[PDB]
């Protein structure tokens with residue numbers, strides 16, 4: 295069944311004293327389930343072993359109480375009581391013949407060490423990089439350095455006892471004491487661990503050697519290493535210290551795991567990166583080391599993956615997000631079913647939950663982080679109770695499509711109707727806005743699976759009244775009629791219409807989605823939504839030749855993007871396009887050719903010229919038909935009716951897919 299062009303992806307690879315059955319490798323990625331939610335972690339990782347990944351890796355595994363990103367729950371290996379708990383994780387992974395790796399981590403000056411109210415560590419005192427907590431990262435003694443190597447070595451020993459095949463030395467993401475020691479912007483020491491490169495690399499070398507001596511006979515020792523830091527010009531570049539660290543340690547480890555420093559550049563959103571964007575930065579690594587190299591590039595194309603290997607860029611196809619979206623990517627290629635891959639769209643909604651220290655989710659794969667909590671599998675569904683039962687789904691958005699898909703798979707008779715000429719509801723027009731193109735795979739994935747199933751009927755020019763739905767006499771109606779952007783500026787900090795909101799120069803995202811743009815001149819985009827829709831309209835408008843000012847009541851542009859790791863890229867994008875950024879500012883009133891605004895801190899007022907105004911403040915549900923159907927139910931017709939997605943409540947597309955799956959699994963129980 296497998297096309298032999300992919301044979302190379304399934305060759306085993308020797309990684310020190312162990313071997314992986316294939317080249318599909320799941321790189322360390324946090325799930326925000328810790329020791330506190332073992333079953334979540336177990337069920338999560340099991341699915342990726344089940345799906346045929348040759349290595350499945352545990353995320354940053356804390357080696358000591360002085361290292362956490364609290365309140366994010368992480369694995370821990372700083373105490374023997376954690377061995378048996380993690381042995382279960384290993385067992386659920388090694389069961390399907392995947393290897394089991396663990397990213398042993400010490401966060402240095404990247405976390406507040408709050409869980410055990412401890413002092414975080416640094417080569418040189420500073421507040422933590424990503425935390426405002428009033429706790430300083432302390433300058434460490436030589437005796438503290440000796441203790442740190444003890445912790446690493448001892449955590450490596452604990453990992454061996456747990457049965458991990460691959461034990462990491464972590465120097466990446468600016469979330470490592472080792473990277474802090476490397477970085478001249480952080481290390482200001484004047485002893486033998488500071489000054490010239492030999493001194494700055496000493497801690498990374500001395501650690502790596504200790505772990506190799508500790509567990510190297512039977513466990514492979516991996517290094518995860520940021521070759522370039524793209525955050526600021528710290529001089530940790532692939533040409534400089536990135537290249538030097540490799541050269542110095544080139545054939546010391548059994549595996550080089552290599553990426554770019556700062557998460558926002560590593561887990562690059564599809565708005566700003568495409569596949570194998572890291573190639574230029576890690577390209578050099580295989581010329582320096584004889585050792586197997588694993589890299590990442592949001593790899594989704596099997597031909598991209600083949601090419602990465604053939605052209606000598608990588609030995610191993612590194613993945614996090616692709617493995618989240620399709621735990622089964624490996625088993626589908628192996629079955630000649632690469633057409634059925636569920637492709638990551640790079641929305642970083644997985645990132646967002648994890649950076650609000652909550653359980654992981656996926657826009658594409660609702661099962662991600664629900665394996666234990668809900669009993670949801672990536673591919674398998676319970677058989678349809680009474681297969682002859684029929685369901686009418688009203689709405690061609692991601693909610694509708696996910697419900698139809700899910701019911702179809704269980705084996706039910708499924709009809710789906712939409713009023714438009716193209717499947718995707720809100721995504722028909724959203725996917726055509728600048729840098730939102732990849733989000734169309736939410737629609738494509740589901741259409742392509744649905745239209746090859748004989749139990750599914752797809753009607754694409756079918757606006758339905760309440761009469762039409764009764765007539766059809768389905769056993770169950772799901773209403774997924776989506777929502778609309780409203781235009782009175784109400785939805786977050788305004789309960790009351792903004793004065794002048796009904797002036798004809800005032801627009802909503804609906805107009806921009808329909809390509810009805812102001813001809814030119816100045817335009818104010820007012821963001822009370824705090825996600826991508828306002829930043830995206832701004833981009834669209836600047837590119838049409840309008841002078842855009844982006845205005846929010848929030849302290850930061852598009853606040854939620856702190857969590858999708860897009861803030862720094864949206865801002866840089868806006869600076870480059872000469873899009874004005876105004877913050878901590880509300881609109882008092884809208885006049886014919888200007889808006890009055892107020893600064894929130896102190897109420898300093900201002901007039902801004904504005905030939906047009908886009909209000910991005912929230913969505914209102916299209917739920918009339920759903921209420922007509924409940925009112926309509928006389929006992930005779932439509933006894934079973936539910937609503938799902940934006941028509942139930944507005945939210946990110948991930949929520950439309952979650953509702954869709956939930957309806958699909960709950961029906962008939």
Ligand SMILES: Cc1cc2nc3c(=O)[nH]c(=O)nc-3n(C[C@H](O)[C@H](O)[C@H](O)COP(=O)(O)O)c2cc1C
Nearest residue numbers: 321322323324353354560561590592613614615644
């Ligand atoms: C939700 C999430 C959690 C992550 N957690 C970690 C982590 O704990 N340690 C780490 O080194 N990298 C982490 N990463 C980075 C990934 O390992 C990977 O390097 C990055 O996502 C690029 O690969 P991709 O394009 O396949 O996602 C995480 C990424 C995501 C999306």
Ligand SMILES: Nc1ncnc2c1ncn2[C@@H]1O[C@H](COP(=O)(O)OP(=O)(O)O)[C@@H](O)[C@H]1O
Nearest residue numbers: 689691692693713719720758775776939940950
């Ligand atoms: N009465 C109706 N009959 C058919 N399709 C409808 C009806 N009312 C709304 N729709 C369609 O349903 C879809 C709503 O989906 P969407 O806005 O993407 O929301 P969601 O995120 O909930 O899926 C749109 O294509 C919309 O035009």
Ligand code: SF4
Nearest residue numbers: 638641642644656657
């Ligand atoms: S959430 Fe968006 S990004 Fe994270 S995995 Fe699912 S699809 Fe890829």
